[PDB]
Design a protein around this ligand. Structure first.
Ligand SMILES: [Mg+2]
Ligand SMILES: [Zn+2]
Lengths: 66, 151, 101, 251, 1319, 85
RNA sequence: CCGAGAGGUA
DNA sequence: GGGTATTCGCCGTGTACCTCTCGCAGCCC
DNA sequence: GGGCTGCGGTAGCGTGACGGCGAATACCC
């Protein structure tokens, strides 16, 4: 279901901007999880270009130049 | 209530009829003013489950897609096929209903001209590409979505 | 109309034609003088006889209820059915009396 | 920070940290003095509950409180909830170069432009006017230009009509539900104090005129002016994205 | 006959039904409640005497001293209400309580005390109520709103569906005390009975029976009836009363008297019960399989061996019968456990019970209640005997005992406040009966089950909290008391009572700030019934049914005036005629109907009485005798509106206004509006601003008079008589002799309240509406308040409105307004702003209020005086300087006018702490206020002395009269003329005592007012002097304001047209305001059209009278036309007696009618349509209500004639230059570097979450990037961006938001290591 | 009569000990030399049948018992003996 | 310029 | 020993704005 | 005057939301 599916994501900021932050941050902390940003709300949190709209060319460029 | 409100608004409502009317209208105001919270929380859960999915290819390279038929509950045919297969790219090439003809090819967007040539031939159901059958890792390819819808 | 203009002639004639639609609609609605009065809501002449026929029908059903011929749920169902039928007849009376007066 | 007066309105975290440090100093002194077992068990237990109350208050039995019976807000309550950092300061932010007023009709407009008052226009476009005033040569420093627009002389209105001209703004009705509730217009200056909004566009915003209010936002940079003209302009949103039906239907 | 301001402008009153009961005083809830709280009422109920007779006499724990009570009193307030609002003190009274300490010797329960002492001690100050129903708490004027809460007494609630997920109903039963512990009984799906106390853990309920010293056999005696098995000749026969076989299957052979009655297999019918009762069948022989499932009732022991056979509540088997049969117990009592009716719920609960005796029952209850601490005999017994059974901590009140005896069908209604054994047992029995089928549940929305708290009850409960704290303090001091060296203020303390009662009147959920912008809004915030508050439900949780209207609201709560939004139906407003019951319920009037003739006697009912009777409808046609003219009439029996016979009814509704409230019965043509638009219309009608020129609704309901009088905004005359003097400041009324006291010669001096601040920054102002030398009667009005016109109620103004689309400028709900509306200042309202400037005491030195300011010039000090404060009357704009205040570092911290406002300084008040010396303007205003007070007390003395000397002239007409010798020596010695030894010399002595009392009182009040001005005022600790400046902006009307009618037709005024472009009719007059017809078919508020046509007819009569009086005619033709205008049509109540208006009161009436003849269209008995047409035929207007209109632009006719009329349109206080705001770069917050929020803080717009999702929905990646990084948060980004803009380079250097680094430090300040990885 | 611990209110150990001396409850708190050697802790001796723990908890100056769980802590008599310094 | 309480607009 | 099945206890419950008051007393150290 | 601190008392205050879901545990093998 949609709230169990958005809280079970491979990106803990996406699952922490949404409902309960305690459960998700302890799960991510004891798992040692890492957030390869790669979505819209991680980049709205961290303050950069959205990887969808005009910023999709910027993220193509950055993903190409690694 | 077994006794109706026989008076309209041009004639005057008396007291009891207006009080029954206020039952019926207070229920509607309470429903809207409490319904809006669930509507907003539904939009929040939906944009946080979506949140990631970006059109990131041009063809996933598949042949699978759902079978769009017109929907029929048991009364007259409710939503026609031209409402469901308007601007969605077909999965395999639709056979013309006569015999084994290539009526439309297998990767054509069905805009209004194609849908009119579908309605003239009375096409049964179209196997069309759906987003849930898209083979793209981390996103949806450009054909399995469909038409832009405002472009 | 605006949808067929957008499908045939594209975006720019549809934008300028949406504006010209809005301008000519406002201008001739101003020239129309389309008010609303108390006389515009035409009461059906057949409305009072429909209500009296429904009152005679509920009188028959309650006279059966005093003599116990029918059940209570069937009485409630018969009263809601005749008031739904009388409501539809009053709506058809006023709708003829407005749509072709 | 102190409020208006002579006393300091202290935060809740200072109460939590000050309690943990008071208890920790007491526990160090008791382990200096070699108190018996039950004293240092209560002392370490009060420190445990103090730390557990600092981190996530109220997850243990009934939450501590300073004034008056309301519990005080801890670190996890600075993160979680509707008013944490995610939902209140990182996903939604308060925004400069922005304005807000009551809307009204103005049916003379073309549907790519909206009316915008002169007072709001001179307040939202203060840096562009400052650039034009030191670029034409009517103000040497920036203090001279700020005095000029604080006085509102006769020459800054031509400057304002020369910063408006091809610069879109984002109008926004306050319950934005879908993407047609943020649309970009070109301003036309209004003698008045009310945003004049083209009527057809109202059916997109769900905006009647019974007391509604809208916010204006200014695209500062150049890529944002081009995004307002090329993606978010009101001429570009004539079909609803939910279907194929036109959203600029005459109401 | 009429009073003299009734003959000024008598409103044409439609309305056919004769009213029998006039409208009660609309503020009687607040006033009767608080008059109950403070009143010297012997026999103790209710009031402060109940509090003192509960808490006193205090005796300590055998300390041989017992402080007792005598009497209490409230002294004068030291500050009258006006100077109390000005200065900021509470409007309170000191509570002088006499206390009598008597102190005993050793061994004196009966012995005489060794010493007494007694004094009038001082505890607290209680805030008195102003005469209009308001408090003045700290300068501001607040209102306590009456709560609506669940009554004390038992409630049988069901919760039928949601629990158990199996469709099995439960049945709980809550005994709600007024004060104390809550006791609930509840079933569980295993059909076992459970008790819980105060929503704690769940105990099986019969343990509370085992706590009341009941053994198991007594409990089984209570909840079960016995079936008797007699050991007999064979197989242990049965006594069988045939009632017990009702509806069960015959398991065995039913035979007796040598005759087979009922065989095995068929169910036992009631005919078989009749056969067994006719055949007299009691004793029948049973098989052994019948007793093999039954349960024993009492205990039995084997007699010879001396041990137990079976315990009570034990099921029986065959070997158990072999045990008990051989012992010698011949009678066997079994429990009849009927599966249909008489269920075995108590017995199975006894099987669940882990306890056996009373002591273990109390130990288990004590382990439930206060867990952990070791249960003891004394501790558990004291706990359970003070849970419900002591007068201290558990008290069902009189309301609770009435509901408790009424829900159990007891006979009595008065009893003791505590419970007993029998009460708990009766609640359990009624709950079991409801489970069995007989009796039913109660609903919670039923207003017979829903009490009202009011001001006196809530303040009395808080005062009782303060008194039990002060009695615990008195018990503290007395056992430590040494005698005789203390007198009763070392024991008692005025601090906790004052602290508690100011806690309630200051910071509570119901003592709230008064909506004061309107006489309607004052009088409908005082009549408010809130479901919220302490002990009630909350806004964000519940619910659906408590937000909904229940059929007991008819005549108690308004159905349609409830605020839309988050709290709908929690903030109900009280009806027009609804009083409050003695117990606090809502009782409404009805007319007692003994037989066919409906009697004019009234009789009040509540909802637990309205159900039993049959109550008629307000408008049912009855002619000349009270007989219902039909043989059948619509009534309502038990909340069900149904049609009943002519002669069955017991009550009738009193009047047809009585369903709705005083907000929504001012709406004419209410019965034609929809319910939704009547709700929006009443809720906006509360919000109207008072215009500068008040203007008399042409289409009113006649309830304007009662609202404008009963809300105390007009200066209603106390004693009638003749006007002696009228000024805009004061009105001096000479009193007629019949209403005038023998001593205290006396003339009434009404001080009017001129231009001052309301609570919503509007202007409350009173203007005299009586001339000089004009008769007024008692109860008549003298000064018109805000939004009043000759004693009526004028919220908005009446304007000529056309219904048509006009070139799109009134598109959705907008409103297009001529220039004649804005030229006449006929909405130009007056707002007043208070602005404070405070000289606080800071380090390095205080802050001066000097004139000299660093870094100003002549343009600052040109408006500021010798002392620095602005002059009175100086027109200021934004960015000006009002009070010069400097801070030595020296930095400018002067008071400056806020951005965007203008105005005129109407008043400057200066408050100074006693000890800080005075700048010279403080002495100027001090001497001005001093001379003003000396002048006004001299005016009181001189004008009252003029009235006293006029009475001396009136008495000296006879009795040795000396006419010429009267005025030879002056007016002081008229007592020493010739007069005999009679009561006229007594009356001269009376007036001499009056004047000498006036001399002494004038001197002492003059000197005391000198002291009360000259002293320093109580300020905050840290502030030295506070200068308050009162601006008064005058806001006109402009594109963007909000106007609305009374029907729910909202509008934002869009274009302010010139006069020429307006749609003019062929007579030449432009129309004033154009509305839009498209709102009317959808929003089904058709009442605004009938208001439009009837207002058109009203101004048609006004134009006709204006022609007959301008083109001036002798008064015969005017009185003939006025008589035709007041007769007009059907059978009405008004007619007029017009030929008794002395040939001048016709003319003054016709002077006050030339702006339009005012028409009362009452609420549900209003004007019919044929009377609107007939009144439009009396005026020379077209009958359809519609005139052909030309266009001002093109000069050519609008096709299809349009509607023009007069609608009463209001200006709501949502003005556009309080909403307009913009921010480029202002101040920034501190914890997260984002802009501030609001308008008073110069802050920017919250670009919230759904706007971010809307920008993600487009491709706006760069717009969003500057929307959350540069414009909002990143400090390096925004300073580089401001410099990049002003260089001419639109380019952002983004960086990282600061609030995300705040997030990193708050997450990292846990045990969490969050980082930022590789480049 | 078994020994319990009481945490008193801060800076009210004198008043708490005064009220518990007016009751029949033994108090014990070491004075260091004059401030107490321990903080607001205090040792009481009573019996829960003679004077109940709720009456002890509702005494002027007593904040709470050292509980650790449901029931208040019994401190052993070797500890109370070894506070005889 | 942070929190709480009350009220209101859409 | 583990399989149902009940109970407990944590999650969540719309957006934007406007106005107002009120925000430590006790205090024995 | 002051540090600090969670109530003020020789107890009991609490009491009008509702659902979903997952772990903890009870009852019955
Ligand atoms: Mg609206
Ligand atoms: Zn695909």
């Amino acid at each position: 279901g949609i709230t169990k599916a958005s809280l079970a994501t491979e990106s803990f900021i996406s699952a922490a901007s949404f409902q309960e932050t305690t459960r998700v941050l302890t799960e991510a902390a004891v798992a040692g999880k890492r957030d390869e940003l790669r979505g819209l709300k991680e980049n709205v949190i961290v303050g950069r270009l959205i990887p969808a709209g005009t910023g999709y060319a910027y993220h193509q460029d950055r993903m190409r130049r690694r | 209530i077994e006794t109706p409100i026989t008076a309209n608004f041009r004639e005057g409502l008396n007291v009891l009829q207006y009080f029954i009317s206020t039952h019926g209208a207070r229920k509607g105001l309470a429903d809207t003013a409490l319904k809006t919270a669930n509507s907003g929380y539904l939009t929040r859960r939906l944009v946080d489950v979506a949140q990631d999915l970006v059109v990131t290819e041009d063809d996933c390279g598949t042949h699978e897609g759902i079978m769009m038929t017109p929907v029929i509950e048991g009364g007259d045919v409710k939503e026609p096929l031209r409402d469901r297969v308007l601007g969605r790219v077909t999965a395999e090439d639709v056979l013309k209903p006569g015999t084994a003809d290539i009526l439309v090819p297998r990767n054509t967007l069905l805009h209004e001209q194609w849908c009119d040539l579908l309605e003239e031939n009375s096409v049964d159901a179209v196997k069309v590409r759906s987003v849930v059958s898209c083979d793209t890792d981390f996103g949806v390819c450009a054909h399995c979505y469909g038409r832009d819808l405002a472009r | 109309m605006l949808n067929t203009c957008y499908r045939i002639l594209g975006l720019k004639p549809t934008v300028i034609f949406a504006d010209q639609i809005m301008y000519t609609g406002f201008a001739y609605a101003a020239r129309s003088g389309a008010s609303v009065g108390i006389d515009d809501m035409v009461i059906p002449e057949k409305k009072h006889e429909i209500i009296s026929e429904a009152e005679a029908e509920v009188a028959e059903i309650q006279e059966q209820f005093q003599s116990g011929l029918v059940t209570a749920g069937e009485r409630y169902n018969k009263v809601i059915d005749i008031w739904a039928a009388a409501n539809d007849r009053v709506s058809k009376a006023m709708m003829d009396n407005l749509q072709t007066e | 920070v102190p409020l208006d007066g002579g006393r300091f309105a202290t935060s809740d975290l200072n109460d939590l940290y000050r309690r943990v440090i008071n208890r920790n100093n007491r526990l160090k002194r008791l382990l200096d003095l070699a108190a018996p077992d039950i004293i240092v068990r209560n002392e370490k237990r009060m420190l445990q509950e103090a730390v557990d109350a600092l981190l996530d208050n109220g997850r243990r039995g009934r939450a501590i409180t300073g004034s008056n019976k309301r519990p005080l807000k801890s670190l996890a309550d600075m993160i979680k909830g509707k008013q944490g950092r995610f939902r209140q300061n990182l996903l939604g932010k308060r925004v400069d170069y922005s304005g807000r007023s009551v809307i009204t009709v103005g049916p003379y407009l073309r549907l790519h432009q909206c009316g915008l008052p002169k007072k709001m226009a001179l307040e939202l476009f203060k840096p562009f006017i400052y650039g034009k005033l030191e670029l034409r040569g009517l103000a040497t420093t920036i203090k001279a230009a700020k005095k000029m627009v604080e006085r509102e002389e006769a020459v800054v209105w031509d400057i304002l009509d020369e910063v408006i001209r091809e610069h879109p703004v984002l109008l926004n009705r306050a319950p934005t539900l879908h993407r047609l509730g943020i649309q970009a217009f070109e301003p036309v200056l209004i003698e008045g104090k009310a945003i004049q909004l083209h009527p057809l566009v109202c059916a997109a915003y769900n905006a009647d005129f019974d007391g509604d209010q809208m916010a204006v936002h200014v695209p500062l940079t150049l890529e944002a002016q081009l995004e307002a003209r090329a993606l978010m302009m009101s001429t570009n949103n004539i079909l609803s994205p939910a279907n194929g039906e036109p959203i600029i239907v005459p109401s | 006959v009429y009073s003299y301001t009734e003959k000024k402008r008598i409103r044409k009153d439609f309305g056919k039904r004769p009213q029998v009961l006039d409208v009660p005083y609309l503020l009687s809830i607040q006033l009767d409640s608080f008059q109950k709280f403070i009143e010297q009422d012997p026999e103790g109920q209710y009031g402060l005497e109940a509090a003192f007779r509960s808490v006193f006499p205090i005796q300590s724990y055998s300390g041989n001293s017992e402080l007792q009570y005598v009497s209490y009193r409230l002294g004068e307030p030291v500050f009258d209400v006006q100077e109390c609002q000005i200065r900021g003190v509470t409007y309170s009274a000191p509570l002088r309580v006499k206390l009598r300490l008597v102190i005993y010797e050793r061994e004196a329960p009966e012995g005489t005390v060794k010493d007494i002492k007694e004094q009038e001690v001082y505890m607290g100050e209680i805030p008195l109520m102003t005469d209009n129903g308001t408090f003045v708490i700290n300068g501001t004027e607040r209102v306590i709103v009456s709560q609506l809460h669940r009554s004390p007494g038992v409630f049988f609630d069901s919760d039928k569906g949601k629990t158990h997920s199996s469709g099995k109903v439960l049945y709980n039963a809550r005994i709600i005390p007024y004060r104390g512990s809550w006791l609930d009984f509840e079933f569980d799906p295993k059909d076992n009975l459970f008790v819980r106390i105060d929503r704690r853990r769940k105990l099986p309920a019969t343990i509370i029976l085992r706590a009341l010293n009941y053994t198991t056999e007594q409990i089984l005696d209570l909840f079960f009836e016995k079936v008797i098995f007699e050991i007999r000749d064979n197989k242990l026969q049965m006594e069988l009363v045939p009632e017990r076989l009702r509806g069960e299957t015959a398991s065995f052979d039913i035979e007796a008297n040598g005759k087979v009655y009922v065989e095995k297999g068929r169910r036992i019918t009631a005919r078989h019960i009749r056969q067994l009762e006719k055949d007299d069948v009691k004793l029948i022989e049973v098989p052994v399989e019948y007793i093999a499932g039954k349960v024993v009732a009492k205990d039995y022991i084997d007699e010879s061996t001396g041990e137990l056979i079976c315990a009570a509540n034990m099921e029986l088997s065959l070997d158990l019968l072999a045990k008990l049969s051989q012992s010698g117990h011949k009678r066997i009592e079994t429990l009849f456990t009927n599966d249909l009716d008489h269920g075995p719920y108590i017995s199975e609960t006894l099987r669940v019970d882990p306890t056996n005796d009373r002591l273990s029952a109390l130990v288990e209850i004590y382990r439930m209640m206060r867990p952990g601490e070791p249960p003891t005999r004394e501790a558990a017994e004291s706990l359970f005997e003070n849970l419900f059974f002591s007068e201290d901590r558990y008290d069902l009140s009189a309301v609770g005992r009435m509901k408790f005896n009424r829900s159990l069908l007891r006979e009595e209604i008065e009893g003791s406040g505590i419970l007993s054994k029998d009460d708990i047992i009766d609640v359990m029995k009624k709950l079991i009966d409801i489970r069995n089928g007989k009796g039913e549940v109660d609903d919670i929305d039923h207003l017979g089950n829903r009490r009202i708290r009011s001001v006196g009850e809530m303040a009395e409960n808080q005062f009782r909290v303060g008194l039990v704290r002060v009695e615990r303090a008195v018990k503290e001091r007395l056992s430590l008391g040494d005698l005789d060296t203390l007198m009763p203020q070392d024991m008692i303390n005025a601090k906790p009572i004052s602290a508690a009662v100011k806690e309630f009147f200051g910071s509570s959920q119901l003592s709230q700030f008064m909506d004061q912008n309107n006489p309607l809004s004052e009088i409908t915030h005082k009549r408010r019934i809130s479901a919220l508050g302490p002990g009630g439900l909350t806004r964000e949780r519940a619910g659906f049914e408590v937000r909904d209207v229940h059929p007991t609201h008819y005549g108690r709560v308004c159905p349609i005036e409830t605020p839309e939004g988050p709290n709908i139906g929690l903030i109900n407003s009280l009806s027009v005629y609804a009083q409050t019951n003695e117990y606090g319920f809502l009782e409404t009037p009805y007319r007692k109907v003994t037989d066919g003739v409906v009697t004019d006697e009234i009789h009040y009912l509540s909802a637990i009485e309205e159900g039993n009777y049959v109550i008629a409808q307000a408008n049912s046609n009855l002619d000349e005798e009270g007989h219902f003219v039909e043989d059948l009439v619509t009534c309502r029996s038990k909340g069900e509106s149904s049609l009943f016979s002519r002669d069955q009814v017991d009550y009738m509704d009193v009047s047809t206004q009585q369903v709705v409230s005083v907000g929504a019965s001012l709406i004419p043509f209410l019965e034609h509006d929809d319910a939704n638009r009547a709700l929006m219309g009443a809720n906006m009608q509360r919000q109207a601003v008072p215009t500068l020129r008040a203007d008399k609704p042409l289409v009113g309901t006649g309830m304007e008079r009662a609202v404008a009088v009963d809300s105390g905004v007009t200066a209603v005359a106390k004693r009638g008589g003749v006007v002696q003097y009228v000024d805009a400041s004061r009105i001096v009324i000479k009193v007629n002799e019949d209403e005038m006291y023998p001593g205290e010669a006396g003339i009434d001096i009404y001080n009017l309240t001129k231009y001052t601040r309301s609570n919503q920054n509007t202007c409350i102002n009173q203007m005299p509406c009586v001339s000089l030398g004009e008769p007024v009667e008692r109860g008549d009005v003298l000064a018109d308040g805000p939004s009043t016109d000759l004693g009526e109620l004028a919220l908005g103004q009446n304007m000529r409105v056309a219904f048509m689309p006009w070139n799109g400028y009134n598109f959705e709900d907008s409103i297009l307004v001529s220039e004649r509306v804005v030229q006449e200042d006929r909405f130009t309202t007056i707002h007043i702003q208070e602005l404070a400037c405070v000289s606080r005491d800071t380090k390095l030195g205080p802050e001066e209020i000097t004139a000299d300011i660093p870094n100003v010039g002549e343009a600052a000090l040109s408006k500021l005086d010798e002392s620095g404060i602005v002059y009175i009357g100086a027109e200021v704009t934004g960015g000006d300087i009002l009070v010069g205040k400097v801070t030595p570092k020296v930095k400018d911290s002067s008071l400056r006018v806020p951005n965007g406002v203008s105005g005129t300084v109407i008043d400057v008040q200066v408050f100074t702490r006693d000890g800080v010396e005075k700048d010279k303007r403080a002495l100027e205003i001090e001497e001005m206020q001093l001379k003003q007070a000396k002048k006004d007390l001299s005016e009181e003395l001189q004008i009252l002395e003029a009235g006293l000397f006029s009475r001396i002239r009136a008495v000296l007409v006879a009795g040795g009269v000396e006419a010429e010798k009267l005025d030879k020596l002056p007016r002081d010695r008229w007592l020493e003329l010739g007069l005999t030894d009679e009561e006229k010399q007594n009356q001269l002595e009376q007036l001499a005592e009056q004047y000498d009392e006036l001399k002494h009182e004038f001197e002492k009040k003059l000197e005391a007012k000198r002291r009360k001005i000259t002293q320093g005022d109580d300020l905050a600790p840290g502030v030295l002097k506070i200068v308050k400046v009162y601006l008064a902006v005058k806001r006109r009307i402009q594109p963007g304001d909000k106007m609305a009618g009374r029907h729910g037709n909202k509008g934002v005024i869009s274009k302010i047209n010139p006069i020429e472009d307006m749609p003019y009719d062929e007579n030449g007059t432009p129309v004033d305001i154009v509305l839009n017809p498209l709102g009317v078919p959808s929003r089904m508020n058709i009442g605004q059209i009938l208001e439009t046509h009837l207002g058109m007819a009203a101004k048609g009569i006004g134009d006709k009278i204006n022609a007959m009086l301008k083109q001036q005619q002798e008064v015969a033709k005017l009185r003939e036309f006025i008589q035709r205008a007041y007769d007009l049509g059907a059978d009405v109540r008004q007619k007029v007696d017009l030929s008794t208006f002395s040939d001048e009161e016709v003319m003054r009436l016709a002077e006050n009618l030339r702006k339009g003849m005012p028409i009362a269209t009452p609420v549900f008995d209003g004007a019919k349509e044929a009377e609107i047409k007939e009144l439009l035929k009396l005026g020379d207007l077209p009958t359809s209500g519609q005139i052909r209109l030309y266009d001002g632009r093109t000069g050519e006719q609008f096709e299809r004639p349009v509607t023009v009329g007069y609608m009463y349109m209001l200006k709501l206080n949502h003005l556009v230059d309080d909403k307009m705001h913009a921010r480029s770069t202002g101040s920034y917050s501190l914890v997260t570097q984002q802009p501030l929020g609001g308008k008073a803080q110069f802050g920017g717009q919250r670009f919230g979450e759904m706007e971010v999702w809307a920008l993600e929905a487009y491709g706006a990646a760069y717009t969003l990037q500057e929307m959350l990084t540069v414009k909002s948060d990143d400090v390096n980004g925004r300073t580089k961006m401001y410099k990049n803009i002003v260089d001419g380079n639109h380019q952002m250097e983004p960086g990282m938001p600061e609030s995300f680094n705040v997030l990193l430090k708050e997450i990292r300040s846990l045990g969490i290591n969050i980082e930022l990885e590789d480049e | 009569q078994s020994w319990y611990l009481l945490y008193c209110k801060r800076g009210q150990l004198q008043r708490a000990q005064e009220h518990l001396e007016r009751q029949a409850v033994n108090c014990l708190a070491p004075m260091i030399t004059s401030e107490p050697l321990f903080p607001n802790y205090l040792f009481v001796e009573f019996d829960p049948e003679v004077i109940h723990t709720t009456t002890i908890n509702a005494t002027r100056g007593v904040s709470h018992f050292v509980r650790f769980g449901a029931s208040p802590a019994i401190v052993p008599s070797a500890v109370i003996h070894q506070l005889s310094v």
